[PDB]
């Protein structure tokens, strides 16, 4: 796992632990896991474009990784999709999983769509950031922002929910509203 | 020095393990495109001089008595920090 | 040296974090009198020279490939000891 050491106010990937004795780790407070959203990287934040990056698969257990520090998200998503017959499509959020804390917009996307897998993964391999946990799957009725987690060594509010009605979630023939 | 008291030792240790986490990967690291829970394991054979295997089956036998006591003391359903505690205990006593 | 390969980098890093755990507190440390889960977070801005931010968004991008492999190997639903293991790995190799 890559690590980040802030040398002279400049971040460098610590791929080798034998870098230099200049790097100091006095306490665990210097170690921090920052979860940065993908919106900063410039990816498309549109609902018809963001949902194409999410795919359903079966056989891969969900995994959750903790991150302490987060990034303010200007575009969050709240999937409440269900199967066309009314069956549940996304697993319920377990204890300790809450919505993303800071969200300028919460794209609450509801509707119907095919659910070919027990869990909804990210096609780009990124995580689904939550209140303080990063999960590889999407939980039902929980605000999340698709993002990535970085581990580094530190040196010594209103949400506007947007309603969507999606038919055919996860397919190239998808209609919104 | 390990003395194998087991009635029979298997010289060949056919072992399964997860991926090295640092080896070459393609698109399989993405959970959506990756293999299922069964496919992530990589197999191998460890017919290593037959002394490293029969002494390992005896080390595991002796570890059980202490491990059962350790699990009984712990109040957590699942324990994942046994190696982390062992590293801490080794490093605390080394002091260097 | 970090080369940001992202098409666009956001110079401003508006970050949210929990309380410092060592800062001045009054009656809010009591859960009964404390704030809800939303109110415990403290915000800030990290427009730090723009080099520490664009290189952080690339470090997170590269960390994902190894982090996904690490989570796949682990059999625990939630992982909280990544920093603890990193501290152990750093300290074991330092040996001082």
């Amino acid at each position: 796992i890559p690590l980040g050491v802030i040398h002279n106010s400049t971040l460098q990937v610590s791929d080798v632990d034998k870098l230099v004795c200049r790097d100091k780790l006095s306490s665990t407070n210097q170690l921090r896991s920052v979860g940065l959203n993908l919106e900063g990287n410039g990816v498309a934040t549109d609902v018809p474009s963001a949902t194409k990056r999410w795919g359903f698969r079966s056989g891969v257990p969900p995994k959750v990784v903790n991150y302490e520090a987060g990034e303010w998200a200007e575009n969050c998503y709240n999937l409440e999709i269900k199967k066309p017959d009314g069956s549940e499509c996304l697993p319920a959020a377990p204890d300790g999983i809450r919505g993303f804390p800071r969200c300028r917009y919460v794209h609450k996307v509801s509707g119907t769509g095919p659910c070919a897998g027990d869990f909804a993964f990210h096609k780009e391999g990124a995580f689904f950031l939550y209140d303080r946990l990063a999960s590889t799957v999407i939980y039902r009725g929980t605000t999340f922002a698709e993002g990535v987690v970085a581990f580094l060594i530190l040196p010594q509010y209103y949400s506007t929910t947007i309603r969507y009605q999606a038919t055919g979630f996860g397919t190239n023939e998808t209609e919104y509203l | 020095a390990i003395v194998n008291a087991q009635p029979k030792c298997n010289p060949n240790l056919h072992y399964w393990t997860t991926q090295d986490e640092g080896a070459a990967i393609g698109l399989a690291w993405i959970p959506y495109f990756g293999p299922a829970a069964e496919g992530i394991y990589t197999e191998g054979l460890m017919h290593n001089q037959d002394g490293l295997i029969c002494g390992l089956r005896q080390l595991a036998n002796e570890t059980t008595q202490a491990l059962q006591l350790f699990l009984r003391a712990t109040t957590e359903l699942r324990t994942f920090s046994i190696l982390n505690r062992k590293a801490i205990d080794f490093l605390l006593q080394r002091w260097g | 040296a970090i080369v940001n390969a992202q098409p666009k980098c956001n110079p401003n890093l508006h970050y949210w974090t929990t309380q410092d755990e060592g800062a001045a507190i009054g009656l809010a440390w009591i859960p009964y009198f404390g704030p809800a889960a939303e109110g415990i977070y403290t915000e800030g801005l990290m427009h730090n020279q723009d080099g520490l931010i664009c290189g952080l968004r690339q470090l997170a991008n590269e960390t994902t490939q190894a982090l996904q492999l690490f989570l796949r190997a682990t059999t625990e639903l939630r992982t909280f000891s990544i920093l603890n293991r990193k501290a152990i790995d750093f300290l074991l190799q330092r040996w001082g």
Epitope: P2 | Q19, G34 | -
Partner: single-chain antibody, 221 residues
């Protein structure tokens, strides 16, 4: 942009050893793996081995386990390969390709003259067609690999260029006439309208949890 500048040509005598250093720039060198490919004259692309700058781990093909040695330097950001017991047939053109974030050797280097493994084989080596027609190149995989398949074209006198880095994920800047799609063990690379500039040797590479990233046999139009 990513530029993998490779070393100059060589004429070392048989039995000696040559160290070909390929400099990498425009990206974090330690983050991406470095792969070396040997192209015999008019034969095809042969994968030699891979080196990980982050950890120093290196893997080679069974034929190239002893012939090639891979070392990298983090500070120099340069990947050098040292060969041993060179012969007449060992003299060929060596390419350094950067292993992509998803396993696609997208950026290559300038030509430098000198079972468990997944076997990918193309249906026809010498597909022939006229301009304006539509042809399909089929790549077969021994095992069930994911949509991850890489397609490269290598015009004569130029380094291979990646076109499709997945089943259908098209590299930007590639003409839209190059359309590929496939799944499972079958992958198809199609050209909507073959042109006079599209006749080259096409290679199929599978990148899905397989340490040997062997290329395909080839397809000359």
């Amino acid at each position: 942009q990513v530029q993998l500048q490779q070393s100059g040509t060589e004429l070392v005598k048989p039995g000696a050893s040559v160290k070909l250093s390929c400099k990498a720039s425009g990206y974090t060198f330690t983050s991406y793996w470095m792969h070396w490919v040997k192209q015999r004259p008019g034969q095809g692309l042969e994968w030699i081995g891979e080196i990980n700058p982050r950890n120093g781990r290196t893997d080679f093909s069974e034929k190239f386990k002893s012939k090639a040695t891979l070392t990298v330097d983090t500070s120099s950001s340069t990947a050098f390969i040292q060969l041993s017991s060179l012969t007449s047939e060992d003299s060929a053109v060596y390419y350094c390709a950067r292993w992509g974030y998803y396993g696609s050797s997208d950026y290559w280097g300038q030509g430098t003259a000198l079972a468990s493994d997944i076997v990918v084989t193309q249906s026809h080596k010498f597909m022939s067609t006229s301009v304006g027609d539509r042809v399909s190149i089929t790549c077969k995989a021994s095992q069930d690999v994911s949509v991850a398949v890489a397609w490269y074209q290598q015009k004569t006198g130029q380094s291979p260029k990646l076109l499709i880095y997945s089943a259908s994920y098209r590299i930007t800047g590639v003409p839209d006439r190059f359309t590929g799609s496939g799944s499972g063990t079958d992958f198809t690379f199609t050209i909507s309208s073959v042109q006079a500039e599209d006749m080259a040797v096409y290679y199929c590479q599978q990148h899905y949890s397989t340490p040997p990233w062997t290329f395909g046999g080839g397809t000359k139009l």
